[PDB]
Enzyme design. Structure first.
Site, PDB file in Angstrom:
ATOM      1  N   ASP A   1       9.081  12.580  17.783  1.00 16.91           N
ATOM      2  CA  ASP A   1       8.909  13.964  17.095  1.00 16.91           C
ATOM      3  C   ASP A   1       9.268  14.855  18.853  1.00 16.91           C
ATOM      4  O   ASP A   1       9.077  14.820  19.622  1.00 16.91           O
ATOM      5  CB  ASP A   1       7.088  14.145  17.189  1.00 16.91           C
ATOM      6  CG  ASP A   1       6.976  13.581  15.654  1.00 16.91           C
ATOM      7  OD1 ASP A   1       7.832  14.388  14.842  1.00 16.91           O
ATOM      8  OD2 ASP A   1       6.205  13.367  15.109  1.00 16.91           O
TER       9      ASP A   1
ATOM     10  N   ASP B   1       8.382   6.688  15.700  1.00 14.80           N
ATOM     11  CA  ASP B   1       8.065   7.993  15.125  1.00 14.80           C
ATOM     12  C   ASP B   1       8.938   9.127  16.410  1.00 14.80           C
ATOM     13  O   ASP B   1       7.909   8.378  17.542  1.00 14.80           O
ATOM     14  CB  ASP B   1       7.036   8.694  14.909  1.00 14.80           C
ATOM     15  CG  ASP B   1       6.650  10.059  14.213  1.00 14.80           C
ATOM     16  OD1 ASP B   1       7.687  10.415  14.443  1.00 14.80           O
ATOM     17  OD2 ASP B   1       6.147  10.478  13.599  1.00 14.80           O
TER      18      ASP B   1
ATOM     19  N   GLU C   1       0.792  -1.134   0.148  1.00 12.49           N
ATOM     20  CA  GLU C   1       0.152   0.324  -0.306  1.00 12.49           C
ATOM     21  C   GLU C   1       1.233   1.157  -0.014  1.00 12.49           C
ATOM     22  O   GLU C   1       1.752   1.118   0.739  1.00 12.49           O
ATOM     23  CB  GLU C   1      -1.050  -0.061   0.798  1.00 12.49           C
ATOM     24  CG  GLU C   1      -2.104   1.369   1.378  1.00 12.49           C
ATOM     25  CD  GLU C   1      -2.914   1.244   2.709  1.00 12.49           C
ATOM     26  OE1 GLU C   1      -2.363   1.315   3.236  1.00 12.49           O
ATOM     27  OE2 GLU C   1      -3.666   2.494   2.462  1.00 12.49           O
TER      28      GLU C   1
END
Ligand SMILES: [Zn+2]
Ligand SMILES: [Zn+2]
Ligand SMILES: [Zn+2]
Lengths: 182, 431, 381, 249
Positions: free
Chosen positions: C108, C106, C41
């Site tokens: 951040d 992730d 995808e």
């Protein structure tokens, strides 16, 4: 409760003996059924004529098998009660359709369960170990688990072997675990 | 007493075929090959679990019997379409079905019903009116094809009854072209007199076997009759298995000098064996190592191959069973034998007689007649005979003992490819 | 950088700079598993914030085509599904399942806002980037030692932080539960904005926590005591006081009134805590609360998560999401990362080697080394 | 190994993986079914009444197992015929009850719970040797770390396992498992991970074994519920299996 009991005619006195359990009597007066005749005046022991008992057992088994394979059917409707040997190929969801009234099912007069239960009962009336464990009480079990009954135990085992052999040939006494678990 | 003082010993009560000398001799089973007829279907050679019949299974077996025979007959007669038996028919239609009686009694011309198969009729029945049929011969359980009309939707009126079609005979291979003619002595029980358990008739027959040295001896039951007066009233001092073992030992050991292949067929009257038809072979006796190749414990019914000659045999009294139910418009035994051959089953009667226990799955699997046998042994309480029915030699040797008096046996000569004269000669002889 | 200039530059980059060959090498994973690239995808974000997903492609040529045609502003990589996403409408309900995906993290900077003093929100500076520098070392070591993941690609997110792609075949077959377990094992700083004490270590320090504290210590003095100056004035050291039991707080305050340097204040705090023993780990809890990475378990738990593709262009900073070399981590500078405008100026100043003439080359080189390692692992195995 | 025995029943405990293939009698079928129903009901009652680690639980469960003649203790003698018989009982009865306890989710859960309890008890009665034998026969391949590697990671192991003393730790041996199987341990950080393997101490091993067992058993029950139509046609076994859960014992 719906099974015929074992009828044996004494060779000496000729009186019928009905056997429905391995053991007869209560307390220390309890002994295997085939030890003494039902007639007090008769001293004959049926355990002496065990060949005759074997033969009568085989004849009775033949009689019951013949009854089953006669294939008698009766209409379940009370107002019809048609009795026929012929199984018609016309079937409803419940079974053969009675050709006398065309509105009720024909049921076997002597179904397979009846014959199976009869053979199981004949095995039951000769199961020494089962009677000792379940049917017999504690003091009675102690009195029966001694010598003076070993010969009777052996003869009862031999007689039960006959019914076991017959049941081994019945499709209604074996469970094929391969067919169940795959 | 009566049996031992008989005066007609050895009398030939019936004869058929080529005349032979007053004395018969055989090869002692030297150049003899006896086996079970190798057909598509496997033979019954071991016990099958019984006493558990589902009504659905019986329905399926009967329906497939009707369907299969009807398919063969439809191919043979080039019939276009079968019609449901129950539906009304103003014009003439062809219907396949099986005959039966509308009540529990014995079949008569006014009590005939035709029951169709599941494929073409959903198993529905219809009364039959035999007023317009000029010639007929019907017994219950007979698969028939009829042309008729049903104007009222309630009564089928046949106008034509298609004839039966027997199976083709066996085409023997050349492997047995050079083998000599084989002698077969066949006898059927009871083997002891009504008031004795000594097997005197069996001893006489064994003496005859050793004297004539036949190639095959076919012994059909009962060997320990259930109807024997001593057996029913429980006067025997030994178990049934012991008496049967003694009888079999007598038979096998006594035939050692003759070297004759023994073919033992059980009977429904054998008090010591499983009461079910088709009857499995006897399995309670182990022949000695010197008689293993000679003794053949076969099933009832049996199709035997003897140097290419196909012999059908059954202990069941088929003729007595079907004679009590067959109805004809006008030889009765020949008609019944032709019915048996054309239905292609060793027991086509449905419902059976009261004296036979039928397991219908086993009946389906082991009663089809593979071919039309060259010889068909059908012992019966009826009179002995040797008949030629559609080229098959049907032999009823009677029973070795008839009550208190001695009975009869049969002896015949079979050779593959003779002349169709596979049966050179046959004789019903007294014991 | 002018973001109105984004629509002008995006095509050229996607035409002559985006490393499609290596990108396909990556997502195709040596062709071992059939339909692997074909069941991947993708999702695109186009101009005016138009979002499309269930995009799949047959091979590199189709991808290059449809990408150069759409000119998307954002590219996100998603899971490998049971069938091709493009035909998800054709797949019977319940039979469309995400089956494999890299294990991704992730980190951040925005999640560190309650504990940094130099910047806020999306602002970053050289004084705070050391936090990322710590995270990459703390996490990557675990992933290389505790879990045995061997192929790990660290990528700059473009603005506020860094992503990690763990691409071992074992890591790509991990269920949702296994991913959540991995995330929780790596996660220490638990709690929201409503909690003050976010780290409560037990008496026993789990080896992983010991090694994370060891990694933290090497940098702590520079990051917290020199650069961040977490004890500069009362408004800030009141927090750290708020993170320790009240019993010694007063004792600390007077001491903090006589200290001139935050290094001195840290020495004083350590001495006071040592004097005060169950609290012997309190300084470690403070260090962790100021240095340990914060992980959004929702990012790594779900298999169907779409994460920013490497070599993407940041819609606002314009920087390229470039891989970070683990060895040269200490030299990494998020402000020198090539922007799209710089690399288009470089491109229009001179076929399969055009990118070697830009400042993008060493980062594609690091990516090529990582892919070479993956190929070696695919072969040797 | 008297007449018709074999190596079909090596160990007492089993995962009940391979269905029986024998032809048994209806009487044997009923006796085995009822006996195992009694055993499982006893397990449930004792679990409700007592704590499963309690000594009363162990004593009462041993008494019930002896009364119903089920395998519960090992025997370092050989595969005696009697022992074989007992094991055969266990193996057949289990599957019979599967047929009884797969129709409804409720029933399934109940069955699983009781079975797990019984298995745990039996494991608790296994000597280390026997334990290893079991772990080998089912290809579980738990060792097991070497002593040298244990010394190599001594401090890490000491800080990994909660409440483990230096000498007591020296007296214990760990096992190496892929971390995908120790999710519940790794998730709260109560077991050391090194190079993708967790180092799990021993009391705990039963837990892992049970997890595997439970997985398998659930799968099996699903399959059995999928193969129900073939059995309902056998009237002989319908009154029993359809109503075993409501059978007075
Ligand atoms: Zn008497
Ligand atoms: Zn009726
Ligand atoms: Zn900053």
């Amino acid at each position: 409760r719906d099974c015929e009991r074992f009828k044996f005619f004494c060779p000496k006195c000729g009186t019928e003996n009905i056997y429905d359990n391995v053991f007869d009597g209560s307390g220390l007066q309890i002994e295997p059924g085939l030890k003494r005749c039902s007639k007090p005046e008769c001293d004959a022991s049926p355990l002496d004529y065990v060949i005759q008992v074997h033969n009568k057992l085989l004849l009775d088994i033949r009689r019951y098998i013949k009854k089953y394979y006669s294939g008698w059917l009766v209409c379940e409707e009370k107002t019809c009660q048609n009795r026929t040997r012929r199984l018609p190929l016309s079937f409803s969801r419940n079974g053969p359709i009675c050709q006398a009234c065309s509105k009720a099912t024909l049921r076997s007069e002597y179904p397979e369960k009846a014959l199976y239960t009869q053979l199981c009962f004949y095995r039951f009336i000769f199961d020494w170990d089962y009677a000792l464990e379940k049917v017999v009480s504690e003091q009675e079990r102690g009195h029966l688990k001694k010598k003076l009954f070993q010969e009777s135990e052996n003869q009862y085992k031999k007689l039960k072997s006959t019914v076991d052999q017959v049941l081994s040939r019945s499709g209604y006494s074996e469970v094929n675990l391969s067919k169940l678990f795959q | 007493q009566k049996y031992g003082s008989r005066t007609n010993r050895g009398e030939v009560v019936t004869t058929y075929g080529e005349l032979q000398g007053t004395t018969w001799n055989g090869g002692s089973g030297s150049n003899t090959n006896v086996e079970l007829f190798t057909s598509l279907d496997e033979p019954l050679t071991k016990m099958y679990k019984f006493m558990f019949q589902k009504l659905m299974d019986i329905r399926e077996v009967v329906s497939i019997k009707i369907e299969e025979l009807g398919a063969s007959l439809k191919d043979h007669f080039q019939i276009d379409e079968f019609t449901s038996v129950s539906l009304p028919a103003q014009e003439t239609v062809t219907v396949l079905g099986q005959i039966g009686c509308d009540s529990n009694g014995k079949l008569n011309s006014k009590s005939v019903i035709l029951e169709g198969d599941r494929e073409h009729s959903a198993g529905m029945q219809v009364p039959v009116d035999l007023s317009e049929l000029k010639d007929y011969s019907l017994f219950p359980g007979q698969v028939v094809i009829m042309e008729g009309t049903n104007s009222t939707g309630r009564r089928f009126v046949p106008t034509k009854l298609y004839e039966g079609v027997p199976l083709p005979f066996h085409q023997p291979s050349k492997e047995f072209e050079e083998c000599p003619q084989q002698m077969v002595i066949t006898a059927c029980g009871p083997f002891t007199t009504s008031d004795t358990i000594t097997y005197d008739a069996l001893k006489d027959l064994i003496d005859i076997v050793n004297r004539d040295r036949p190639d095959i001896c076919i012994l059909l039951g009962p060997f320990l009759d259930a109807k024997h007066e001593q057996i029913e009233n429980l006067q025997l001092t030994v178990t049934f298995e012991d008496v049967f073992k003694r009888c079999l030992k007598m038979i096998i050991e006594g035939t050692r000098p003759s070297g004759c292949h023994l073919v033992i067929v059980p009977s429904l009257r054998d008090v010591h064996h499983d009461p079910v038809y088709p009857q499995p072979p006897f399995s309670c006796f182990e022949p000695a190592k010197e008689d293993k190749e000679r003794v053949h414990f076969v099933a009832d019914p049996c199709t035997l191959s003897v140097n290419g000659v196909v012999i059908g045999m059954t202990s069941t009294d088929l003729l007595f069973h079907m004679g009590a139910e067959e109805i004809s418009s006008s030889d009765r035994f020949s008609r019944i034998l032709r019915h048996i051959l054309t239905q292609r089953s060793y027991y086509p009667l449905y419902p059976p007689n009261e004296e036979i226990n039928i397991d219908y799955e086993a009946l389906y699997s082991y009663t089809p007649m593979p071919v039309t046998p060259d010889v068909f042994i059908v012992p019966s309480e009826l009179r002995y005979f040797i008949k030629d029915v559609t080229g098959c030699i049907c032999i009823n040797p009677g029973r070795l003992t008839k009550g208190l008096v001695g009975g009869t046996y049969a002896r015949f000569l079979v050779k593959s490819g003779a002349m169709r004269s596979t049966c050179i000669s046959a004789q019903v002889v007294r014991v | 950088y002018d973001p109105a200039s984004l629509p002008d530059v995006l095509p050229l980059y996607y035409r002559r700079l985006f490393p499609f060959y290596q990108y396909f090498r990556w997502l195709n994973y040596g062709g071992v598993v059939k339909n692997y690239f074909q069941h991947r995808e993708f999702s695109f974000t186009l101009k005016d914030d138009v979002y499309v997903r269930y995009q799949s492609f047959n091979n590199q040529s189709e991808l290059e085509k449809e990408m150069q045609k759409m000119c998307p502003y954002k590219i996100d990589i998603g899971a490998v599904y049971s069938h091709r996403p493009s035909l998800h409408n054709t797949v019977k309900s319940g039979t469309f399942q995400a089956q494999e995906k890299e294990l991704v993290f992730d980190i951040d900077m925005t999640d560190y806002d309650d504990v940094r003093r130099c910047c806020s929100s999306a602002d970053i500076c050289p004084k705070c980037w050391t936090l990322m520098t710590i995270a990459v070392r703390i996490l990557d070591r675990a992933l290389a030692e505790d879990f045995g993941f061997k192929h790990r690609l660290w990528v700059y997110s473009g603005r506020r932080g860094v992503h990690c792609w763990v691409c071992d075949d074992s890591a790509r077959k991990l269920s949702q539960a296994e991913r959540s377990a991995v995330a929780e094992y790596l996660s220490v700083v638990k709690g929201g904005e409503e909690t003050i004490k976010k780290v409560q270590l037990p008496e026993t320090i789990h080896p992983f926590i010991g090694k994370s504290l060891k990694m933290v210590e090497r940098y702590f003095e520079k990051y917290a005591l020199v650069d961040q100056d977490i004890l500069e004035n009362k408004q800030c050291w009141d927090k750290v006081i708020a993170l320790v039991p009240e019993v010694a707080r007063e004792s600390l305050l007077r001491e903090f009134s006589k200290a001139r340097s935050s290094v001195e204040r840290w020495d004083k705090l350590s001495s006071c805590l040592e004097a005060t023993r169950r609290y012997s780990n309190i300084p470690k809890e403070i260090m962790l609360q100021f240095c340990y990475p914060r992980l959004d378990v929702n990012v790594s738990k779900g298999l169907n998560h779409l994460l920013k593709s490497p070599f993407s262009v940041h819609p606002k900073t314009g920087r390229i999401s470039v891989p970070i070399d683990c060895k040269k981590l200490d030299q990494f500078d998020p402000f020198s990362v090539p922007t799209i405008s710089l690399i288009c100026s470089e491109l229009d100043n001179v076929r399969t080697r055009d990118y070697k003439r830009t400042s993008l080359a060493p980062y594609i080189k690091v990516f090529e080394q990582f892919l070479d390692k993956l190929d070696q692992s695919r072969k040797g195995e | 190994t008297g007449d018709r025995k074999g190596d079909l029943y090596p160990s007492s405990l089993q995962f009940y993986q391979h269905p029986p293939t024998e032809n048994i009698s209806l009487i044997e079928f009923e006796t085995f079914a009822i006996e195992r129903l009694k055993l499982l009901k006893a397990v449930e009652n004792l679990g409700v009444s007592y704590v499963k680690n309690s000594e009363e639980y162990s004593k009462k469960l041993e008494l019930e197992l002896r009364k119903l003649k089920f395998p519960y203790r090992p025997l370092h003698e050989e595969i005696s015929d009697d022992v074989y018989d007992l094991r055969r009982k266990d193996h057949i009865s289990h599957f019979i009850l599967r047929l009884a306890y797969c129709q409804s989710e409720d029933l399934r859960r109940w069955f699983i719970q009781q079975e797990m309890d019984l298995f745990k008890f039996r494991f608790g009665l296994l000597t280390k040797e026997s334990v290893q034998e079991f772990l080998k026969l089912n290809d579980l391949q738990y060792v097991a770390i070497s002593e040298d590697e244990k010394n190599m990671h001594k401090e890490d192991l000491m800080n990994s396992s909660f409440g483990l003393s230096l000498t007591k730790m020296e007296d214990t041996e760990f096992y190496k498992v892929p971390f995908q199987a120790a999710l519940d341990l790794v998730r709260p950080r109560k077991v050391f991970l090194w190079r993708g393997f967790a180092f799990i101490p021993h009391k705990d091993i039963v837990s892992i074994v049970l997890n595997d067992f439970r997985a398998k058993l659930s799968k099996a029950l699903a399959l059995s519920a999928r193969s129900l139509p073939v059995v309902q046609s056998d009237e002989r076994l319908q009154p029993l299996l359809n109503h075993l859960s409501h059978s007075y014992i």
